[PDB]
Amino acid sequence: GSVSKWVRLNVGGTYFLTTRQTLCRDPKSFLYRLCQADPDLDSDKDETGAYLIDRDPTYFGPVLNYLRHGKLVINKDLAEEGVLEEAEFYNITSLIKLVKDKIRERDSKTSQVPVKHVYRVLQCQEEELTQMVSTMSDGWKFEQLVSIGSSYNYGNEDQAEFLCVVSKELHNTPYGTASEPSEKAKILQERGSR
Amino acid sequence: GSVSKWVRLNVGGTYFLTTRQTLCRDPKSFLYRLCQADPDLDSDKDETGAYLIDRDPTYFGPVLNYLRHGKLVINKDLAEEGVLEEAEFYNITSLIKLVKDKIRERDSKTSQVPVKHVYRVLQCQEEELTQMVSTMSDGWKFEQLVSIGSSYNYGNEDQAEFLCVVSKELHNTPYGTASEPSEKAKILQERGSR
Amino acid sequence: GSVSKWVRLNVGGTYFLTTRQTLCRDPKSFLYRLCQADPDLDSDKDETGAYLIDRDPTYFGPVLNYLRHGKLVINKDLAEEGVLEEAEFYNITSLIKLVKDKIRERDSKTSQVPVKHVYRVLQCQEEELTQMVSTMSDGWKFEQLVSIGSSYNYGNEDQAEFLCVVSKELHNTPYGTASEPSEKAKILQERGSR
Amino acid sequence: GSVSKWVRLNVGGTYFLTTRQTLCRDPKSFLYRLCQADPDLDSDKDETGAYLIDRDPTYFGPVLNYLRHGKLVINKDLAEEGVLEEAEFYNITSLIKLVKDKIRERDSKTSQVPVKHVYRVLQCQEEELTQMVSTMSDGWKFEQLVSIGSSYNYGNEDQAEFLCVVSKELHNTPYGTASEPSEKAKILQERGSR
Amino acid sequence: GSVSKWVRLNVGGTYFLTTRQTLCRDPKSFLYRLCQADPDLDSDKDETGAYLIDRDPTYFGPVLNYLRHGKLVINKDLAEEGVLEEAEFYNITSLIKLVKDKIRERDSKTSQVPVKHVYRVLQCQEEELTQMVSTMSDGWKFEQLVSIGSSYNYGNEDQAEFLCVVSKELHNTPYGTASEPSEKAKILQERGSR
Amino acid sequence: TMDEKYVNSIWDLLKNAIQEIQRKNNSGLSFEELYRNAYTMVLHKHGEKLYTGLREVVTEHLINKVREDVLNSLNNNFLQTLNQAWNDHQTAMVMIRDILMYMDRVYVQQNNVENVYNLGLIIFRDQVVRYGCIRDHLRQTLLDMIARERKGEVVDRGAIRNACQMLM
Amino acid sequence: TMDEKYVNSIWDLLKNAIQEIQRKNNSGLSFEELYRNAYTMVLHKHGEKLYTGLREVVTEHLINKVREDVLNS
Predict the structure, then answer these.
(1) Which residues of G touch E (CB under 8 A)?
(2) Is G2 exposed, middle or buried (0-12, 13-18, 19+ CB in 10 A)?
(3) What is one Gene Ontology biological process annotated in the Swiss-Prot or TrEMBL record (chains A, B, C, D, E)?
(4) How many CB atoms lie within 10 A of CB A178?
(5) Residue C6 and residue B45: Cα distance in Å, rounded?
């Protein structure tokens, strides 16, 4: 009548026929709990045997994409944040992870508008300069080169002669603008600070 | 069949399925009159069900998302102005303010051309610049390091030896609470002028 | 099929039950005539009698929303070009004033294809950067800052020590020359040439 | 039905009602095949009287074509691959070369993918500097300024004191052309080379 | 499912009505099963009867266009990575190569998004400096000049005069096909490393 | 990840219907349900279990039908029994192949394992034409008929050719 | 350039498509594909083979389609 090997689910106005297996990405997900009948559920679309739940199908889009395909790719025009909201309502920690990774990727891609951008400084000698700019790591963009005085070996050709400065759009944080701290890391940071 | 416990809306000719209570999260919305079973409807049909809502379904998405879980969604294809129009159609004041902030953040970068970019200058020596750039602040981009010519304390190994100018684009809303300063702010400004 | 208030619309081959007002907001649009009955209607078919339209589009949506609310639609991936191309065609009468800015803004972007940047040299003593750097004008971006020596004391602590160089884009429409019939302005320019 | 002078082309599923005559222009176009009823067809339905059009109008539009009502041309945001294949579907090698040149124009005026940029070194001393910095040629962009070691006037104000490296992004030619048939030009180039 | 010359796929709940013949291009793709009206693939829907495919319609677009008219057109508003994943799902090697070429073009165009980006340093003095700045290659962008201390006089006309760091936005090739070393190449690399 | 309990629960009925199909019966099952169920579990990397289950049911069917029928048959139609058993095996294998293409295109390639068609052919080769008793029976019987045929005696050459085709 | 390993398959496919066009069939054939086929099979200096195949295939079309309909009615 309303349940089979497959199940019809009314996310938003539209009805998707999807297997009960595919709809669950962790047994804590609300969708799985909705797959089997519960005495708590009262409002449903019994006209076609499809359960009624109230969420946007546009952010169900990437969610079902990950659920069916096993890999999450959020469109460049759609809010990864909407995907995260969909996941958090449906309580899927796996989707929390991917939306997190996608949001890090986007923050790398949006590392022009304020979001953390990695910058690093390297030393090089006049001779080494060509090598280490040439052998400068892929995924990094050269940003600046500065000549300095030579405290050793005349005025040029010094082991400390040129400061290269490079950068990476992807932020160094484990996630976005805020990551859950660890206390021993702060202990060692204080140790190295003094 | 229009409502028994669930409501089928016809948003701009697009059928959507939800429940009375998801709309009743905010009982001041325009959909309150539409969903509840009452002969106040000025647009409805019981020949095939579903009240007639002649409004954007494209910009009904984020508004319904806020109506369901109190969170605005800013898509990349979403005209923040258009979702502001829909939100003011459905009377969500906090959503109005948030979308206004989104609109102005987008305008300060895109439509008003990139403006009011914040620039800062930081005195650093090598031992300081290395980790300062390494510990470069969130949402900030390195712009230029320059080596100041120095005769005191040689021209190297001096706390005042390098100037690093950085910046942060303001895709930022101008303050609507008052971007115009007060009298005492200007007093302190003229005090700090010289 | 005009048998009730809802009528049949042919998109994708599917027949949609849309109310008259979702097709009717002004006499200029094409959806209006399908809600008017006349014996010249040759859009009738032998399946159900639905009325056929070319629509299977990609850009009709946000600009139909524009028709329905009257605010030009710019997206973060579809700028004033999108207005200038689609919102014009859907025949919103208010756009004529609005699209002009969309036209100028568009020009203001396309004018920078032959990059037009106002470039300014500001001499500063070292102690004098961070102020005017921090108080950079809106739309004025820092671009370069070059050291320079001086005759006395190597240059540092002298007004001839740094040259900042900044640039500002134009919001101007593309030009090929600027001319005014005032001869005395030309006299003044020639006088100031030497 | 589609066996008479009128037909219902299922373009993207959508029923486009059209005369056979407007579609029978020549066999170069695909459509001529579908409207012309012939044996050995497998693109037709007798359940509704329609000749299917397997191409949904999503790149049936940007097809470079003439002689009916529609639109075409690669834009500055329209895909290069689609316009290229739609041009190749209309034969001629001159057409292929011209469409490639048009794509190179729309990509090389901003110099992206053709990546065409022009660079110059202006030798200016200090007093002159702000002049050509302020009086730079429009359509150009300043990129770097570097001082020169000097042996007169305390290393400042030499007859050669600064190199202003300027640049601009644009196509040298939107066709991407190279090589000249004038042998005297080659002679002069070699003469000035040493 | 229902027998017709075309077939209606429930691609992500979305009905794709496409002819069976255009799906016979690649039996080596999942689609060629879905087109069987005989019990080789049997699938139905309790609302329409459409066959069921648990593949997204997000990236089904360009792949289906490649099947229909032989050329892929990745819309420049959707992830080319998603199109590559959809190509992998139907494992069409030519389509894989085409989407990877698109991603390479992206990475060359988006080398500042962290992907391949090549850099070099030239060495020249002013006389040759003007020449090779002027004769800079099309694609290679000048990024920085710098002086190097000159033991001759104080400045110019020394062989060690100017380093010229230049860059080029280079394509990043998706791994598994590129950056594959060789044994004798490594022998020579070890020889030249010292 | 997804809980495997009901996946395995329905996998039991799936394998039972698979064995029914192996017996050339499709009049007591929904082919659409088998196709959908079998296809679904491949996406989410249960294809190892499917591969092993197909392997074991194919092996059991082969052992309990083809070897038994071959050993029960007497010669001079030993070839007929072998040929018809091989034909039933090929029909069952083709109908099973009809159920699965996605695994036979993605799982076997990504696991770099044998295709279930090729795997079942390997099982048939191991259990019929390389299995000692059946192989020697076939060899001596073929030798006998090809000896007698040169004498002008009446033998059926089609069966001999078919057996040789099975061999190579 | 000159190498016969690949020319045979594309040649037979191209001639089959030419006949399909002769058999009034373009609802399943893409002009871009056949056009590219003809171009790659030309520019490799196999244009003599196309001249021959063209001549024989137009004669074949005249016999197989034109002559039958001319005579039958």
Answers:
(1) 28, 30, 32-33
(2) exposed
(3) proteasome-mediated ubiquitin-dependent protein catabolic process
(4) 9
(5) 9
Question: How far apart, in whole angstroms, are the C-alpha atoms of residue D135 and residue C121?
Answer: 11
User: For residue B180, with 0-12 CB atoms within 10 Å meaning exposed, 13-18 middle and 19 or more buried, which class applies?
Assistant: exposed
Residue A91 phi, psi (nearest 5):
60, 60
Interface residue D50 vs chain G (CB under 8 A): no
- DSSP label of D147: E
Query: Is B57:B11 a contact under the CB 8 Å cutoff?
Result: yes
3-state secondary structure of D146: strand
Q: What are the φ/ψ torsions at residue F156 (nearest 5 degrees)?
A: -95, 110
Residue with tokens 């079309």: G61
Outline where E36-79 has alpha helix (H): 60-69
* Nearest CB partner across the interface for E28, out of F26, F32, F105: F105
Backbone angles phi, psi at B21, to 5 degrees: -80, -35
CA–CA separation, E173 and F80 (whole Å)? 58
The identity of residue B33, as a single letter, is R
Q: Which residue of D has its CA nearest to E149?
A: D149
Reported as half-sphere exposure (CB side, CA atoms, 13 A), residue G54 has a value of: 9
Q: Taking a C-beta distance cutoff of 8 angstroms, is the pair F66, F89 a contact?
A: yes
Asked if A96 and A80 count as a contact pair (C-beta separation under 8 A), the reply is: no
Tokens linked to G4: 């016969």
Query: How far is it, in rounded angstroms, from Cα C73 to Cα C58?
Result: 14
Which residue intervals of E70-194 are DSSP H helices? 80-89, 93-109, 126-134, 183-193
Separate counts of helices (H) and strands (E) for chain B: 7, 6
Helix, strand, coil shares of chain G, percent, nearest 5, are: 75, 0, 25
* 3-class DSSP state of E18: strand
Residue C83 near residue C109 (C-beta atoms within 8 A) = no
Q: How far is E39 from chain G (nearest CA, A)?
A: 25
E102 residue type, one letter: K
Neighbours, chain D (3 or more CB pairs < 8 A) = C, E, G
**Residue D39 CA to chain centroid, in angstroms?**
42
Pair C168, C141: CB distance under 8 Å: yes
Pick from E54, E139, E62: which is nearest to E103 by CA? E62
**Dihedral sign for Cα atoms in the order A103, A105, A108, A110:** negative
* DSSP character at residue C83: I
Residue whose entry in the numeric block shows the structure tokens 């004041």? B93
Residue among A51, A45, A95 at smallest CA distance from A74: A95
Burial, C50: exposed, middle or buried (Cβ in 10 Å; 0-12, 13-18, 19+)? buried
Min Cα–Cα distance to chain A from E14, Å? 9
Whether D81 sits inside 8 A of E75 (CB atoms) is no
**Closest by Cβ to G35, choosing from D27, D30, D88:** D88
Q: How far apart are CA A84 and CA A92, in angstroms?
A: 10
D4 φ, ψ (degrees, to nearest 5): -105, -175
Check if the beta carbon of residue D192 is closer than 8 Å to that of residue D165. no
Determine whether the interchain pair E40/F40 forms a contact, defined as Cβ–Cβ distance below 8 Å. Answer: no
Neighbours of G22 (CB within 10 A): 16
Provide φ and ψ at B145, rounded to 5°.
-100, 140
Dihedral sign computed on CA atoms, order C167, E139, E102, E73: positive
What subunits touch chain C, counting only 3 or more CB pairs under 8 A?
B, D, E
Record: contact B77-C75, CB cut-off 8 A = yes
Q: Do residues A108 and A79 make contact, with C-beta atoms less than 8 angstroms apart?
A: no
Amino acid in the structure at residue F42: V
Alpha-carbon gap, residue E22 to E9, rounded angstroms? 13
Cβ atoms within 10 Å, residue F121 = 16
* D141 chain-C contacts, CB cut-off 8 A: 115, 117, 167
